[PDB]
Design a protein around this nucleic acid. Sequence first.
RNA 1: CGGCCUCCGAACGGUAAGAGCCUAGCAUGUAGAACUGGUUACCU
RNA 2: GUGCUCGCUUCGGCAGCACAUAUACUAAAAUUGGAACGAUACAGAGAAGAUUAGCAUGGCCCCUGCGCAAGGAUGACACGCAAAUUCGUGAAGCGUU
Lengths: 34, 299, 49, 222, 290, 107
Amino acid sequence: QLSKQYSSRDLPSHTKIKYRQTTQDAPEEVRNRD
Amino acid sequence: PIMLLSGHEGEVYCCKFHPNGSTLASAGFDRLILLWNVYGDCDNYATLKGHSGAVMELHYNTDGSMLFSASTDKTVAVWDSETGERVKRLKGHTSFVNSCYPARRGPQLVCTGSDDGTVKLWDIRKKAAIQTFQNTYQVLAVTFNDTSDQIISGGIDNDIKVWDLRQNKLTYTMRGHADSVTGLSLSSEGSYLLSNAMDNTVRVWDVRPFAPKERCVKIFQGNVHNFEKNLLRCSWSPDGSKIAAGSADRFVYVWDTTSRRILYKLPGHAGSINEVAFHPDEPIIISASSDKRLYMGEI
Amino acid sequence: VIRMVEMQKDPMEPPRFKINKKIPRGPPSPPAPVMHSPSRKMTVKEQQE
Amino acid sequence: NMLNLLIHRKNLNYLHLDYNFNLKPVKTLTTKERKKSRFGNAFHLCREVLRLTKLVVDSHVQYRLGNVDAFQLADGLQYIFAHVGQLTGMYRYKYKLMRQIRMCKDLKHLIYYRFNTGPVGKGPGCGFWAAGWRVWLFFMRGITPLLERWLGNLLARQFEGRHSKGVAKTVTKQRVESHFDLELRAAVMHDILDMMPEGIKQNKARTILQHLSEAWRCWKAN
Amino acid sequence: WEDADFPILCQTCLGENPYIRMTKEKYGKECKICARPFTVFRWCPGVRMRFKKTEVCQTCSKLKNVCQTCLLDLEYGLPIQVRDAGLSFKDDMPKSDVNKEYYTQNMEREISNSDGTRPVGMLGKATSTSDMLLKLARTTPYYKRNRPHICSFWVKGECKRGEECPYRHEKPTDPDDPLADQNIKDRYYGINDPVADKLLKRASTMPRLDPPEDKTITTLYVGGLGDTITETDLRNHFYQFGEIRTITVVQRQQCAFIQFATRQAAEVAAEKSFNKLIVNGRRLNVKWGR
Amino acid sequence: PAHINDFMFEQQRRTFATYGYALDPSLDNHQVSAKYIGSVEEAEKNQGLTVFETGQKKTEKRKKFKENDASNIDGFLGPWAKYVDEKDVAKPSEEEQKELDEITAKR
RNA sequence: CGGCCUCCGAACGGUAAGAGCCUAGCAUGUAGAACUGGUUACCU
RNA sequence: GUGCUCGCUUCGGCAGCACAUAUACUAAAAUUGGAACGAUACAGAGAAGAUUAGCAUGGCCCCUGCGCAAGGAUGACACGCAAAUUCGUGAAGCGUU
Ligand SMILES: O=P(O)(O)O[C@H]1[C@@H](OP(=O)(O)O)[C@@H](OP(=O)(O)O)[C@@H](OP(=O)(O)O)[C@@H](OP(=O)(O)O)[C@H]1OP(=O)(O)O
Ligand SMILES: [Mg+2]
Ligand SMILES: [Mg+2]
Ligand SMILES: [Mg+2]
Ligand SMILES: [Mg+2]
Ligand SMILES: [Mg+2]
């Protein structure tokens, strides 16, 4: 029982996840750090 | 492991090993020839192209240096496993060429069985025909004799036929199969030859200088046919120990040369198994089935 | 042996059925056993408190 | 036909949409029908777009029947595109239109004041309708996904039904205080009247909440 | 919404050819009982037979254990009321709107936790097929079900479509007959379905062995014995069923007379054997002797 | 979940449809033989002929018309040529007609 | 050698809310439909 | 039905080959049932003395709206024992072991 209604706010948006880059604080560095 | 391979869009009719035991070739309805590496993860490196019809039979040379592949589109093809590229398009066949066989350890020579009513002998270098024994009708499988001087063929009239390359007459005709023969494969003995036929019986014969004049040796039960009448193919093991067969019953049939017992009717498939391939080195089995994929069983 | 083929959907066709039906919610799952520690006593004075 | 099928499916027999896409009642309607028969901006935006196209295709039909002329058709089309404000009444329902409307004025002041640079006069016969046409085509490029969404929602709601079960409406500006008090007294009820009890029998939490409200009024009264 | 792999249908209704071609439509229609949307599968039964369609949810099927279009039971194949009575079942599925939608919701939630293998509930606890059920069962496929309807035109004369008249251009059945008006809802709920009553009267008029008056008449006459039977064979027919006290194998009349040790044992044996004790292919007639 | 070949399934189905017998499809783990199921004796006497395979049939084809000159204004029957051995009206007659009136009254 | 020229219109919040009532519409276009008739004999 | 058989073989047919390969919720119906916020008439509006603004909570209540916005009498509805596990003193009188 799936509706075909819809919403202005369920349009696609921010469809890519940012990942924490090499210098910002990647889980590798924090794995290292003291 | 079971190691099921996929990546083929339609039925795979033919699967066989490198005679090295290094690389895998499979082919079928999709009109192209896929290659894989047998070891590791059973991975796919290359794909050969060009054949307009269905690849009905692929065949190696005995070193593994050039590839023969019989196509539905009236043609055979020899290609370079070195490159994958065509060296020769054996045209001239007047109908569906289903079966191909390169001469082993002799001069480079090919026998092709076709749906025209002829068996054709060809030399690769001349781009011309050598000999052709028009018996009456379609020939469905063809294999040489280890002297490269007789040629064996099996078709619709159930009497397995053998021609002498020098007198060019019906040398040896053998009888006893109740319906059409679908597959021949001569063991590495150079002597014992295996015949599948959809009448549900498989037979063993032996081409020698002297045979008992009625050389129907061993007989096994189990193979099936149905409304499909797909082409069913058999093989010996590298050792002449186990016979492997497929059938339209989804069961890989593994029997023995010795006790003719049913060593296996293995399930696992979804569609008819058309070709089973034995590893020239290992106890490795590869099943090509009409369910659009392959299996890599280890025994 | 039967041949399944899925019937085409008409692009210009509105939904067919009424979705919004209300009913009370089902019974939950079988109640789990209450594994407590034994109760202690409240004197009259505490209940006064 | 589509808009009439909509009107008559909702069971609104007292209204009818006439052939220039005007919506008119054929009775005087009581409150219940003045309410039941209100329509939205989807319906009306579709109505007004269809009215613009009917104006255009009917100018072309007049040309083809023999009634007008090539020049009268061209200038009448230019007219249509310049004056969408006074012919349709679209701006009522998506007021952003005035972007477009002001644009088709600016163009007309250009073209006109370059059309009539010489003996040519201030009269009607100026139909160079490329510019306004372009403008309304770009407007339509923008509006079609919007209207397809709005009309999909309307049709769904009309054929499935509106979902009043798990609406879960946000907390906006009229519900800030009532919601603060909802959550404050939910918190208080969690807080002690069930987690510092041992007034076992019936912990009277409905009466501690009365004390809470009265303590607040007493704070406010000092 | 339901979602299935195939219909679940009677062999009668599935057709004659081994090779059938069938179409699926996802969320295609509304179960006439479950009231919710289902997937609807449509197949051509045979040459010149109407296309049939699955007409009840897969859950509404698994619950009462019937064929999604034929509506008859799955093993025996009688109307739902007949099968219920023969299994002595009491099916408590609600009737009113709200109660029925609620019951359907929870029954579906609980059938979600199944294996998809056998009906849920008493339809497993009532599979003891009584000889009445086996006796009423259909034997070969009554494939008259799949022929087309009656041509209103060709009943009035009008079916000017030549031979292609979309309905069997035969005589319309007299509407007075009880076997005419059987609404789907009742035939699923089993409340006053005429075919059920006619079949039940037929099962009541069917031959079963009669009981005697006196308790002391503990000799049971089996007629039609034949001389391929042994006294030990008549024993094995009436030996472990209780105890037999004596056996007279009358060869001058090809019959037998079994004196038992327990009245209920012999009664169960002979009634359960009535015309159907088929040992070495002989129709013996089990009755109480004089 | 089978995967079979396509020309062959339709071949067997049309066979069973127009001829009444067919190569039975059971792929049993007990090796059965090719048995013509359905009208077995029909398969025997007809030599297994398929509706797709050409075969000798002296069967009288129903008589049809043929007006394929497309210049006659009301002439061209072309592909829409009726069968000549066809009826010109379709109706039920005096007894069944009154009986159907009686039934429609009874209903 | 100087040029500078905003805006602009519609809805809701006023015209109570309700049970019955009865008849169009509007939906359905189906599923199913039937089967018989077996009987006694020996010693006081 | 089209063409070709070096087919009979005339130019009549017959044959052979090739080419061409399975539409369809079968209905002009016939059914069968429920709504129009329409009449009809009843009916008839929270809080506190009076007159009135509203924002909520609950759910087998909806309606208008694209709406997760807003509106619908604060949209309607929401109150007669809203009593639940469970007692014992103190005295008297009467009859009893
Ligand atoms: O009615 P509008 O949208 O404002 O357009 C008109 C019109 O244009 P049409 O010819 O398309 O009706 C006039 O054009 P002419 O009178 O020049 O032929 C005229 O423009 P003019 O000023 O150039 O006369 C007039 O303007 P106004 O009322 O100031 O005279 C005005 O255009 P505006 O947008 O210029 O008002
Ligand atoms: Mg108000
Ligand atoms: Mg008040
Ligand atoms: Mg509100
Ligand atoms: Mg107010
Ligand atoms: Mg409210």
